[PDB]
Design a protein around this ligand. Structure first.
Ligand SMILES: [Cu+2]
Ligand SMILES: [Cu+2]
Ligand SMILES: [Cu+2]
Ligand SMILES: [Cu+2]
Ligand SMILES: [Cu+2]
Ligand SMILES: [Cu+2]
Ligand SMILES: [Ru+3]
Ligand SMILES: [Ru+3]
Ligand SMILES: [Ru+3]
Lengths: 279, 279, 279
């Protein structure tokens, strides 16, 4: 990324409120505001070095928590019953997530770095691994950017949760929309019981941390199809319609009975005039 | 690759005919000529930069199509019913696949590049995701070479399609044959309903784009066993019998009930005299 | 690794005895000594270049073998019935495993190198793919170090074998223990019928050969969750409690019904005083 927008150095303390709430249809969701919970829950995005203090309130009548992948947390923020890190009905707790930049340890080794595509979810609704909470919709994405990472025009979250996408009914999407040439970021998370294969028509990405290649030397596989299982997370950027043009470009699980039974959506890539050939 | 044969720069327009045909036993296959359809379908191999105009004829009495992974195609060549890209019984359509080399975009980012191990398959027989067509044998491999890629002595295609290899009956192979020291390329594709693990005895490869390491700096895992799911594709080269000698070297799915029920074949690596110790 | 301990150049001939034995409870295990078989079997660790002559005795009343992944072996040491490489009841056979360093071939290509996280298992108990032997506990880890690889304080082996960890009953661990700051190596192997997702709380690693990054240029995904299938093997090192502190840090399969039914253990990271907050 030279003149594309790139992430700055991180290092700020940030604060945020989150709620877990039962929804009217029986699902459960997270939100930054009461009455505005979503499934998936809202995107949290930070830079390496940032600390995030989340003031979490459980508005439900059963215990619930927040567990995160990837980021640094102490045991008091693991979100488990075992470590007394869950939240009673109506209660509030502050969870802290930290992130760090990569760098050389004293022994001359290289410490990895927090950056990546991650996710948060419940760990105590229905079972002590959060099986009911996850099923009901308590999951959401987290992005940690490294300094210099390329930033997108927009970010969409796609979760394969059992045999649904984002807890939707079969064959109801979601659909996402872009214009030819937009830089679109996809955060792809899987939950539940089953393995899946995520496929996008007309587009492809690098099987590495960022989903993009910095230059000619990266030997990573370039793919359009990727096996995933429960609690896996990856992400990538694509240039919408790059080399292929506008169209109603399908994305789906490529396990045949899964696509047949509704794990399908559309990436609607428009011309400037807003039209889509064949749609 | 210094003095091994390496792929040249691409950039040619190529033309080819393909047919979909029902076979006498009830399967369905692609071929470059009528009466010579195979399962898997024939290998298509191009260099990055090439364009391929495929003049496709559906000789079957049901609609059928050709969808490809990885390569650049416009929406009119996606092979779906939705985009009116399938082919009626007896009909002909020209599908176009393009490929591009990697390079620097105007924004200073690096555009990936088409090269890889890919595949084509039907998208409309039995269901609108091609479940019946895929089951019946409408799939085949595609290789896109980058300039400088090492070329093999021979290429073999292994497809895990449900609980078959290449739609064969249990325990009937296929078997492949080589001589110690041959450079053998394997294209490995999975289709259907199930996950698998591809394993080869006596040999190993790099989990990256080419399946080979260019030099000492590539940190990719070297493996002999790899989980795959529907529509996954990867490929590699091995030197037959390198460091291990001649033998009837098994390859199989390593999921235990799958190997037990017949997802097994042999890589028959011969001495110059044509014999195989233990066989 | 500058001043962390690093593996030396390999090249030695080594000798070792192994036994396969039935255990009192009906399982089957390997050991370096009679009466001391374990499940998983003992760790074998060598440097690239080493040769290992294993003098194997089958003390059981059914045929058994030793098959290895990754390492160089001739067909006479593949461990299969087909190649007459298994061992009758009460019998002895010498299996030979070799390893090689990476280097430039005559054609200018780069030959991979044996180094990695590998495993050995039976290939003839119950079926000719060793399904019964594997089920009963005939599996163990193998590590091949490359010169310069970072060495750990300790190595733990975690095997997802069907719906068990290391053939243990549900919810019985195993648990591993460390002190904050220890360099812990994990060898993670999967066997059987099912796919899994390996997850560790509070820790993460690089999805590459060593599980660690040498420096800022490696683009490998940093993860805490990884899909695996039968006969897959990977490994990594983590600094216990790095950035997160002491705690009873869970590891588990993240497939929800699997964790619910007992594929869970604890990574007990202690302060110097031996205590664990929340435990
Ligand atoms: Cu699926
Ligand atoms: Cu999780
Ligand atoms: Cu299989
Ligand atoms: Cu496909
Ligand atoms: Cu599992
Ligand atoms: Cu094996
Ligand atoms: Ru958990
Ligand atoms: Ru499709
Ligand atoms: Ru085998």
């Amino acid at each position: 990324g030279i003149t594309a927008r790139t992430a700055p150095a991180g290092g700020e303390v940030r604060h945020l409120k989150m709620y877990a709430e039962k929804l009217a249809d029986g699902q459960m969701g997270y939100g930054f505001e009461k009455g505005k919970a979503s499934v998936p829950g809202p995107l949290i995005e930070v830079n390496e070095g940032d600390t995030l203090h989340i003031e979490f309130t459980n508005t439900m009548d059963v215990r619930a928590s927040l567990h995160v992948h990837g980021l640094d947390y102490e045991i008091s923020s693991d979100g488990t019953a075992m470590n007394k890190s869950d939240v009673e009905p109506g209660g509030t707790r502050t969870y802290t997530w930290r992130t760090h930049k990569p760098g050389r340890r004293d022994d001359g080794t290289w410490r990895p770095g927090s950056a990546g595509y991650w996710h948060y979810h419940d760990h105590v609704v229905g079972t002590e691994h959060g099986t009911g909470g996850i099923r009901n919709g308590l999951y959401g994405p987290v992005i940690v950017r490294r300094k210099g990472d390329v930033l997108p025009d927009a970010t969409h979250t796609i979760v394969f949760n059992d045999m649904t996408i984002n807890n939707r009914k079969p064959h109801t999407g979601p659909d996402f929309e872009a214009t030819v040439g937009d830089r679109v970021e996809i955060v792809m998370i899987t939950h539940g019981e089953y393995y899946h294969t995520f496929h996008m028509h007309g587009h492809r990405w690098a099987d590495n941390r960022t989903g993009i290649l910095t230059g000619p030397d990266d030997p990573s596989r370039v793919i359009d199809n990727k096996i995933t299982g429960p609690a896996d997370s990856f992400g990538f950027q694509i240039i919408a319609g790059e080399g292929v043009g506008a169209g109603a470009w399908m994305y789906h699980c490529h396990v045949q009975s899964h696509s047949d039974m509704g794990m399908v959506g559309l990436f609607l890539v428009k011309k400037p005039d807003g039209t889509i050939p064949g749609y």
